[PDB]
Amino acid sequence: YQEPTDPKFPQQWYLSGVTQRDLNVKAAWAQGYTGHGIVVSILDDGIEKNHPDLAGNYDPGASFDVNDQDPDPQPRYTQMNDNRHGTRCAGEVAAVANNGVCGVGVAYNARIGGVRMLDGEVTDAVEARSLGLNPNHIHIYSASWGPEDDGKTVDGPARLAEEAFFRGVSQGRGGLGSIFVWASGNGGREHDSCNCDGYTNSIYTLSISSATQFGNVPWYSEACSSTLATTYSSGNQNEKQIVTTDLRQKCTESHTGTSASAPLAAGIIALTLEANKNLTWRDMQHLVVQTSKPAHLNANDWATNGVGRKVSHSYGYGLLDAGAMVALAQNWTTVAPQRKCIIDILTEPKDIGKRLEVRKTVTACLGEPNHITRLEHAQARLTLSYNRRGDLAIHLVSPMGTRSTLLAARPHDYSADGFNDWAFMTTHSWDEDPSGEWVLEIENTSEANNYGTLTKFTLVLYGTAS
Numbered sequence: 001y002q003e004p005t006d007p008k009f010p011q012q013w014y015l016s017g018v019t020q021r022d023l024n025v026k027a028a029w030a031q032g033y034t035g036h037g038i039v040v041s042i043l044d045d046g047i048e049k050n051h052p053d054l055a056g057n058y059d060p061g062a063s064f065d066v067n068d069q070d071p072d073p074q075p076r077y078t079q080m081n082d083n084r085h086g087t088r089c090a091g092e093v094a095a096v097a098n099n100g101v102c103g104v105g106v107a108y109n110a111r112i113g114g115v116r117m118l119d120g121e122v123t124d125a126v127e128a129r130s131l132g133l134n135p136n137h138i139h140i141y142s143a144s145w146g147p148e149d150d151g152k153t154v155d156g157p158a159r160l161a162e163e164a165f166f167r168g169v170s171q172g173r174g175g176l177g178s179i180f181v182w183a184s185g186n187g188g189r190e191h192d193s194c195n196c197d198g199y200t201n202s203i204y205t206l207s208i209s210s211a212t213q214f215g216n217v218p219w220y221s222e223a224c225s226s227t228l229a230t231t232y233s234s235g236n237q238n239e240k241q242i243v244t245t246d247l248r249q250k251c252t253e254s255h256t257g258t259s260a261s262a263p264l265a266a267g268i269i270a271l272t273l274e275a276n277k278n279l280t281w282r283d284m285q286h287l288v289v290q291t292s293k294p295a296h297l298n299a300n301d302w303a304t305n306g307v308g309r310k311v312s313h314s315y316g317y318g319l320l321d322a323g324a325m326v327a328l329a330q331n332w333t334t335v336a337p338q339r340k341c342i343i344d345i346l347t348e349p350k351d352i353g354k355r356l357e358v359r360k361t362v363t364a365c366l367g368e369p370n371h372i373t374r375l376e377h378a379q380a381r382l383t384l385s386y387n388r389r390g391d392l393a394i395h396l397v398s399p400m401g402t403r404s405t406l407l408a409a410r411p412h413d414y415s416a417d418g419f420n421d422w423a424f425m426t427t428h429s430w431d432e433d434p435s436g437e438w439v440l441e442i443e444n445t446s447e448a449n450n451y452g453t454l455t456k457f458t459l460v461l462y463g464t465a466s
């Protein structure tokens with residue numbers, strides 16, 4: 001195998017780096033993995049299917065225009081180039097290699113499509129029709145949309161979109177499950193906390209955050225326990241950005257934000273799926289957990305969990321490692337069927353006041369078909385009232401002592417509507433045994449005399465017993 005010759009490949013520092021600050025993609029390419037036979041779809045504002053770095057890999061079967069209800073996802077051209085984002089993301093995954101144009105995609109032999117669905121009124125039906133597009137042809141979906149990143153919104157998929165997620169992971173891809181790769185958000189400057197975004201907080205989305213070139217948490221990053229891993233993106237003006245295809249058959253060197261990280265992850269996942277086409281949607285999350293690398297990502301919250309892995313609320317398990325992903329995929333044994341252990345915790349409502357702690361010792365469905373000794377995702381589904389929602393901080397401690405932040409204080413969130421069975425999710429106790437004492441902590445981080453009540457706490461464990 002030889003290095004790509006594309007003119008901008010040297011500028012794709014997150015791929016071509018020789019200083020170990022990269023995604024280790026050349027190592028996967030050298031093992032023979034390029035995305036051949038894999039199909040990825042970008043759910044965004046359209047895709048310039050005639051772009052000279054996309055046309056060779058473009059797949060109409062991975063594409064649709066949900067905004068105008070037609071098969072052709074070509075973007076709507078405007079004076080400000082508003083609808084360029086899907087084309088940028090598509091090139092990150094699957095820009096053609098060795099063709100003298102722009103740079104290359106991570107999976108430069110994968111097929112690439114786009115759903116034009118953000119250029120219009122984005123209803124629940126629009127989202128669901130996009131997530132559910134051709135799920136026995138498209139393997140991997142990439143998306144970075146969700147509720148407003150204003151630091152005061154709590155929202156997620158409505159009924160049709162949630163149903164699309166469960167249909168995709170259950171019957172998609174011949175029953176192995178659609179892989180929904182998701183950006184964790186861009187609300188960092190608003191002090192947003194991404195478990196408040198029900199798309200990235202879902203167990204069905206494989207959620208990705210960003211790191212800057214120098215290894216730092218970018219200004220736009222949101223921290224939360226639902227994130228699984230990290231890829232490089234933009235930072236300050238001394239740090240390089242993402243280099244990819246752009247609208248009007250151009251290249252760009254200034255693609256930015258967490259929405260540039262999710263497509264790189266989708267590309268790495270395409271290489272991995274080429275290495276083992278039989279991986280399930282859960283297998284893929286396991287591989288990410290096992291192979292991602294904290295090293296040289298700076299964060300003040302790196303903590304070692306109960307099985308000895310380092311995990312951060314900014315980075316998840318760390319930077320994706322493509323060579324490690326494709327290597328581990330090849331002889332990976334399919335995980336056992338997913339179990340779900342439901343533990344309704346409260347015997348009475350609990351006043352929150354300044355601070356509330358709820359302790360509960362659980363058997364994790366000992367004796368039952370849903371007995372779990374090997375956790376995957378855990379949720380604390382909470383129903384509570386409070387007079388100012390953003391003054392709350394919420395933590396959940398596993399029996400192995402891993403303290404997941406479920407919610408950080410959000411200064412702009414003035415809502416008096418509380419949380420209505422909101423399923424705060426953590427990945428940080430993956431592979432732990434969830435038997436034992438769990439601790440929920442709710443605290444008022446403000447000096448104000450705030451007040452409210454916790455009326456339901458359901459601990460929901462997913463995982464296996466093998």
Ligand SMILES: *[C@@H]1O[C@H](CO)[C@@H](O)[C@H](O)[C@H]1NC(C)=O
Binds near residue numbers: 278334
């Ligand atoms: C895929 O995995 C399932 C579950 O382990 C197994 O039954 C099946 O034979 C595998 N298929 C291939 C083609 O490896």
Ligand SMILES: C/C(=N\NC(N)=[NH2+])c1ccccc1
Binds near residue numbers: 144146149183
């Ligand atoms: C609000 C938002 N994303 N919010 C998120 N990912 N939580 C968005 C992304 C692309 C186009 C329009 C809106």
Ligand SMILES: C/C(=N\NC(N)=[NH2+])c1ccccc1
Binds near residue numbers: 122145146148156
């Ligand atoms: C997808 C979405 N919102 N989804 C939600 N609120 N459940 C959205 C928000 C702002 C602009 C464009 C899209």
Ligand SMILES: C/C(=N\NC(N)=[NH2+])c1ccccc1
Binds near residue numbers: 157158162163
């Ligand atoms: C699946 C569902 N509702 N199903 C029902 N009411 N039978 C739902 C409602 C709101 C948000 C997300 C999902």
Ligand SMILES: [Ca+2]
Binds near residue numbers: 068071
């Ligand atoms: Ca169209």
Ligand SMILES: [Ca+2]
Binds near residue numbers: 098
């Ligand atoms: Ca190229």
Ligand SMILES: [Ca+2]
Binds near residue numbers: 184222
């Ligand atoms: Ca957000």
Ligand SMILES: [Cl-]
Binds near residue numbers: 340
């Ligand atoms: Cl479920």
Ligand code: NA
Binds near residue numbers: 201204206207226
């Ligand atoms: Na997720």
Ligand code: NA
Binds near residue numbers: 303305306400401402
């Ligand atoms: Na620990």
